[PDB]
Amino acid sequence: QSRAKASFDTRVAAAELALNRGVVPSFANGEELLYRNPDPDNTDPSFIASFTKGLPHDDNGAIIDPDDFLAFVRAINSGDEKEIADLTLGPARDPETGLPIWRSDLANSLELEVRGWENSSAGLTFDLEGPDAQSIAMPPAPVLTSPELVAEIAELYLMALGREIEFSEFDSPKNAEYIQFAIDQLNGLEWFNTPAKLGDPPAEIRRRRGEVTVGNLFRGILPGSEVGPYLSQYIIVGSKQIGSATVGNKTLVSPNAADEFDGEIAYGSITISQRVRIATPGRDFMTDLKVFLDVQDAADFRGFESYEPGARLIRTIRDLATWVHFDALYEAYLNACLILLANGVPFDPNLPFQQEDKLDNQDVFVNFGSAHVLSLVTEVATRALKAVRYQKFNIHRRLRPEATGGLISVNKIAPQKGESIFPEVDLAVEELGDILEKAEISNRKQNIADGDPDPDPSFLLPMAFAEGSPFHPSYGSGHAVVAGACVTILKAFFDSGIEIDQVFEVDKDEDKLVKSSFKGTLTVAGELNKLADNIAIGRNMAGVHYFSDQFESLLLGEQVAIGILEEQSLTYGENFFFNLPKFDGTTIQI
Amino acid sequence: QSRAKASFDTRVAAAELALNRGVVPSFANGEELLYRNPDPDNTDPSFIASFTKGLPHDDNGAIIDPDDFLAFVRAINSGDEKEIADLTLGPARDPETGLPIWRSDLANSLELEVRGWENSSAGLTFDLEGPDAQSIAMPPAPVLTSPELVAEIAELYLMALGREIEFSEFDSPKNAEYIQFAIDQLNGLEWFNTPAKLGDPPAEIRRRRGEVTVGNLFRGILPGSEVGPYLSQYIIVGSKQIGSATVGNKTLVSPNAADEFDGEIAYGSITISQRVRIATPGRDFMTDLKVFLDVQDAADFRGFESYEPGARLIRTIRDLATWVHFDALYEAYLNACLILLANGVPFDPNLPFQQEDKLDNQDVFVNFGSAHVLSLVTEVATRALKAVRYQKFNIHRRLRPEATGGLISVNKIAPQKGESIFPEVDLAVEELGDILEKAEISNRKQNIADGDPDPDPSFLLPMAFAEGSPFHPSYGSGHAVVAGACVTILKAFFDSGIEIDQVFEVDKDEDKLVKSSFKGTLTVAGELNKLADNIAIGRNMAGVHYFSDQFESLLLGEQVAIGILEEQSLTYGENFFFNLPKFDGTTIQI
Ligand SMILES: [Ca+2]
Ligand SMILES: [Ca+2]
């Protein structure tokens, strides 16, 4: 047949394959319509559990008009630019200047404008590769009354309180008090001490975590993230630099060979420094109710974060939060791919032409080579993002962990002021009494530092970012969907079972890599899973994402990547497959 | 209709759109079968102008067995792994050790093995996005006897002879002798002084260059590649760093703000250093006939290049050659995109939601935002690479500039040894007289430095890389095709018309960025075209690609990107288009 018709039939075959996977229905937790206005004479939904950021809020963090959220959902579903623009974004605007009237003095003095919902209808966008954004689904988000939400927001609060704690010193006695406090608080929660019961949803059982120890504290559940040092090699260590190649019987050493152990990735002929910008230690955001409410009302606080001069390898929890703050979509995975290519980590042996050229007479760059994996790991990200945008906006609309912390803080302040509000987060408030007390101390210190001499007792989740979360619902996680997709691509493409001989950690005292005390072995698959978990949990340590968004959008991204790979496999005439170890421990051949 | 059915129909509509542009026939120059065996009693084609690298060669750089190249072509056209592996790659192997017997002492002492053709059938690979690898065409490559090839190889030889000369000092008196010699040599060539005649193919007229001046010496013909400093901003300058954002009426300044002018790109929360690894100055490769013939016989010299400690911003021509040596496929363009994003260069105003969020109520990250352009600029690369691989292997199979230099050198040595061979490059040998004399001086110096006390007079094209060119035909250029595709993506996505207020050059004396003396204005489109120019001509400055491969691969890549964008536009329900200034000077709306 003709080459043009052959290409058309290949594309139609890939589209038919995407069709044949079917559309997995997407089920929400029911919190959108479950919780109503606490007013005895108002039956409208409160939408407190829904992502209502941008829509005007009352002083308690609840929507003023549920019609605002209903129109927001209508705009999400329609996708029309005019209808999205017709949405009420932000608070009432000042008649004189046209600027929104902010509740906090900080946002008013800054003359902050509103920030819009980032791609409220990207889930309606179609894709020419991979599953449709709406074809694959995410399980229902944890409900606020669930012990899973309690454990999630507890992990978020402990991550916020431990943002200055260095990863290499999780086991160190200098952080022992806080680490043991967090471990014993999480292990005091039903979600961590009590196992899943028979009849729980498969996703609920699968994402349920066991006893929290120092070895898995603030860690993931993907295989290989809990094994070894906390941070992935690909986020801290560099790569074999230019000049360190093997030429026949002679091995040349790069004059810059120390850059591999200085956290410098050979980015072609230039270098990528793994060192992250140092966000100001101890500076948390949205710890005051007025600033938090302004952020809920779309206060564009983006870029307001202060940073220390220079850069360093990720050591503190805040360092990982900063890393996941600005990463260029596929940054972590593209960097992992660059490390694996420069380190000469072999591709999947089931790829063609991966032998020595004495045997196959064929090197691999465009297909089954460097360029192929570099392009796949980067193109999977936007389609996983479209899928997660569908999950965020059209299906779940889960409130951000900042919004949960706001509900929790208002609920905890209400008895102090004599009322009772947000009984939905009553379980969260009671089960995290000590965590919330530590958070209140931290928020008092921050609000004194912010400028309030006598700050109102605030139990808001401290935010690593001034704007807090990105302006979309928490469930699922875009960074974690890109994590799943890109790490899935890399594991399928590279020989993911290859063990990493040299395992590094960030030095506890200095800003350099040290050989990890980990006496076990780390695989490429294990460290890629660790990198995906690192980015995802770094989103958690920013206060912008719960753990379920993380893990279920990691699964969703893995599904998106599997679909993309399955469709692109129809385009290569070579006899081959991708040996892909999935996040459940199974290996699929694509 | 069903969302799954809508996704299927969108993908099938994109495939129909790709099918409807048609398959542009790909015409070769006829060089493959034009030149025959110089033997009086052998009528077989010599394939001297064909890419025969890897197949065994005689002492003159011609193929030993024409059936070898014919089987290579059959394997290219079939794509079968067994047929590719059955190809004879390299010279006769040693019966005892199994290692190939190399003509040069260097490759034998190094015990080099053969390196295989990289993706000899990647053009047979289909694409779910964009034009098919065989749907678009390049014009026939210039023939060896053409004055265009004479000008190309003269430019290559002058670039090799000028590899240690800094870009900021093209006009400087210290390099004035060489620059004027190159200008007068090129302007003495028919392709540069005589304009295109009526009846020439439109591609020849379009790619014909006029008078060579110091302002366009070793420059491109893309719009904006001739105005301003030689190097693009995006290949030398950094980007606005983390912390230098605008928050309402307050402008925060990054504590690392100097990194923008120190050649550091804000790569998320970590940094990309624009400084390139310093290749050894004056160390040229494949300057001896025996080493050149071994490289033609697939001597795997990859990684044999020596480098200086540290890194520097691209100053010398060898620096640009080194930069394009290892660049990770879309690295230049991804870096340009990262600079444009960090510098806050606005996207195309015709993209939706690009207004202030007070008006549209919608930020753009996944769609029409940072993630969208970052993913497009990287997925376009592999599609353009498949198209260019088709052009290289299945259509043109153009010999590399190293192979042209080998034919020229053998032709210029034959009268000195009383013989006559390769009258195809007779015009190049005659016209490149002074250039070939300087190249002979440089090659004799290098081969003395290599280890030959009295080296045979060699007129080979000096190569920046030990392996020389990659194992694919020169026409077209993979780096140039990725440049065209990705720079086209960036111009369509970003507001490419925005002028760059601050224009920088690498300091003539120091390794730092200095304000350019350029009193004109550089646009984003102009500097992106300049970046594609810089990558493509740095491939020329490596000795691995001619100028025609470069320009036509840039055009082809722009076609690839236009096709990909046209099919992506079928996936977005938003009312918008990409304002894309093509390399033609025209703007298409996608
Ligand atoms: Ca191979
Ligand atoms: Ca906007």
Short mmCIF file of all heavy atoms in Angstrom, two decimals, chain B residues 375-393:
data_model
loop_
_atom_site.label_atom_id
_atom_site.label_comp_id
_atom_site.label_asym_id
_atom_site.label_seq_id
_atom_site.Cartn_x
_atom_site.Cartn_y
_atom_site.Cartn_z
N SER B 375 6.42 20.98 25.78
CA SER B 375 6.18 19.66 25.21
C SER B 375 6.22 19.69 23.69
O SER B 375 6.73 18.75 23.07
CB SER B 375 4.84 19.12 25.70
OG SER B 375 5.00 18.40 26.91
N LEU B 376 5.67 20.74 23.07
CA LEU B 376 5.67 20.82 21.61
C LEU B 376 7.09 20.91 21.06
O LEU B 376 7.44 20.22 20.09
CB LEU B 376 4.84 22.02 21.15
CG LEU B 376 3.32 21.95 21.21
CD1 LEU B 376 2.73 23.27 20.77
CD2 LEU B 376 2.80 20.81 20.36
N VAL B 377 7.92 21.76 21.67
CA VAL B 377 9.27 21.98 21.19
C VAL B 377 10.12 20.73 21.32
O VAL B 377 11.19 20.64 20.72
CB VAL B 377 9.92 23.17 21.95
CG1 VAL B 377 10.58 22.70 23.24
CG2 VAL B 377 10.91 23.89 21.06
N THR B 378 9.66 19.75 22.10
CA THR B 378 10.41 18.51 22.27
C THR B 378 9.83 17.35 21.48
O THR B 378 10.59 16.49 21.02
CB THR B 378 10.46 18.14 23.76
OG1 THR B 378 9.14 18.21 24.31
CG2 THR B 378 11.34 19.12 24.50
N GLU B 379 8.51 17.31 21.30
CA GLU B 379 7.91 16.25 20.50
C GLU B 379 8.08 16.50 19.00
O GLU B 379 8.10 15.54 18.23
CB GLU B 379 6.43 16.09 20.84
CG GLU B 379 5.60 17.34 20.63
CD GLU B 379 4.98 17.42 19.26
OE1 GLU B 379 4.99 16.40 18.54
OE2 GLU B 379 4.49 18.50 18.90
N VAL B 380 8.18 17.77 18.58
CA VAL B 380 8.43 18.04 17.17
C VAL B 380 9.78 17.51 16.72
O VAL B 380 9.97 17.22 15.53
CB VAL B 380 8.30 19.56 16.92
CG1 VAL B 380 9.56 20.29 17.33
CG2 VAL B 380 7.97 19.84 15.48
N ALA B 381 10.72 17.35 17.66
CA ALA B 381 12.10 17.02 17.31
C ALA B 381 12.21 15.62 16.73
O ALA B 381 12.87 15.42 15.71
CB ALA B 381 12.99 17.17 18.54
N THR B 382 11.58 14.63 17.37
CA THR B 382 11.69 13.27 16.87
C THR B 382 10.95 13.09 15.55
O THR B 382 11.38 12.29 14.71
CB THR B 382 11.17 12.28 17.92
OG1 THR B 382 11.35 10.94 17.45
CG2 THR B 382 9.70 12.53 18.23
N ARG B 383 9.87 13.83 15.33
CA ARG B 383 9.16 13.76 14.06
C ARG B 383 10.02 14.34 12.94
O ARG B 383 10.17 13.73 11.87
CB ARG B 383 7.83 14.51 14.15
CG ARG B 383 6.66 13.69 14.69
CD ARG B 383 6.99 12.97 15.98
NE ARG B 383 5.86 12.20 16.50
CZ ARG B 383 5.10 12.59 17.52
NH1 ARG B 383 5.32 13.74 18.14
NH2 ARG B 383 4.10 11.81 17.92
N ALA B 384 10.60 15.52 13.17
CA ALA B 384 11.52 16.08 12.20
C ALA B 384 12.72 15.17 11.98
O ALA B 384 13.24 15.08 10.86
CB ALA B 384 11.98 17.47 12.65
N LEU B 385 13.16 14.48 13.03
CA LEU B 385 14.28 13.56 12.92
C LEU B 385 13.93 12.37 12.04
O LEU B 385 14.76 11.91 11.25
CB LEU B 385 14.70 13.08 14.30
CG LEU B 385 15.83 13.84 14.98
CD1 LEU B 385 16.38 12.97 16.07
CD2 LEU B 385 16.92 14.19 13.98
N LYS B 386 12.72 11.83 12.18
CA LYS B 386 12.29 10.74 11.30
C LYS B 386 12.23 11.21 9.85
O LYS B 386 12.67 10.50 8.93
CB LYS B 386 10.94 10.20 11.75
CG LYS B 386 11.04 9.14 12.84
CD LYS B 386 9.71 8.97 13.55
CE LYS B 386 9.75 9.56 14.95
NZ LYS B 386 8.42 9.55 15.61
N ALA B 387 11.69 12.41 9.62
CA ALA B 387 11.64 12.95 8.26
C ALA B 387 13.04 13.11 7.68
O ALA B 387 13.30 12.72 6.53
CB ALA B 387 10.89 14.28 8.26
N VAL B 388 13.96 13.67 8.47
CA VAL B 388 15.31 13.88 7.97
C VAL B 388 16.05 12.56 7.81
O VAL B 388 16.92 12.44 6.95
CB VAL B 388 16.08 14.86 8.89
CG1 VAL B 388 16.74 14.13 10.05
CG2 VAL B 388 17.11 15.62 8.08
N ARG B 389 15.73 11.55 8.63
CA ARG B 389 16.35 10.24 8.45
C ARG B 389 15.90 9.60 7.15
O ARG B 389 16.70 8.97 6.45
CB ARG B 389 16.03 9.34 9.64
CG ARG B 389 16.94 9.54 10.83
CD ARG B 389 18.38 9.19 10.49
NE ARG B 389 19.25 9.16 11.66
CZ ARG B 389 19.68 10.24 12.30
NH1 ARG B 389 19.34 11.46 11.93
NH2 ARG B 389 20.48 10.08 13.35
N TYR B 390 14.62 9.75 6.82
CA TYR B 390 14.15 9.35 5.50
C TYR B 390 14.94 10.06 4.41
O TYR B 390 15.47 9.42 3.50
CB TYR B 390 12.66 9.63 5.36
CG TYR B 390 12.13 9.33 3.98
CD1 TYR B 390 11.99 8.02 3.53
CD2 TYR B 390 11.79 10.36 3.11
CE1 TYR B 390 11.52 7.75 2.27
CE2 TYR B 390 11.31 10.09 1.84
CZ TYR B 390 11.18 8.79 1.43
OH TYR B 390 10.70 8.51 0.17
N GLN B 391 15.06 11.38 4.52
CA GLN B 391 15.80 12.14 3.51
C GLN B 391 17.25 11.67 3.41
O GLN B 391 17.80 11.56 2.31
CB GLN B 391 15.75 13.63 3.84
CG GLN B 391 14.37 14.25 3.70
CD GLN B 391 13.73 13.95 2.36
OE1 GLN B 391 12.57 13.55 2.30
NE2 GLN B 391 14.47 14.15 1.29
N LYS B 392 17.89 11.41 4.55
CA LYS B 392 19.29 10.98 4.55
C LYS B 392 19.44 9.63 3.87
O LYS B 392 20.23 9.48 2.93
CB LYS B 392 19.83 10.88 5.98
CG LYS B 392 19.95 12.18 6.74
CD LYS B 392 19.88 11.87 8.23
CE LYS B 392 20.05 13.11 9.08
NZ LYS B 392 21.33 13.80 8.75
N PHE B 393 18.68 8.64 4.32
CA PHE B 393 18.98 7.26 3.98
C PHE B 393 18.25 6.77 2.74
O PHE B 393 18.84 6.06 1.92
CB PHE B 393 18.65 6.35 5.17
CG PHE B 393 19.70 6.36 6.24
CD1 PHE B 393 19.49 7.05 7.42
CD2 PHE B 393 20.89 5.67 6.07
CE1 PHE B 393 20.45 7.05 8.40
CE2 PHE B 393 21.85 5.67 7.06
CZ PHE B 393 21.63 6.36 8.23
#
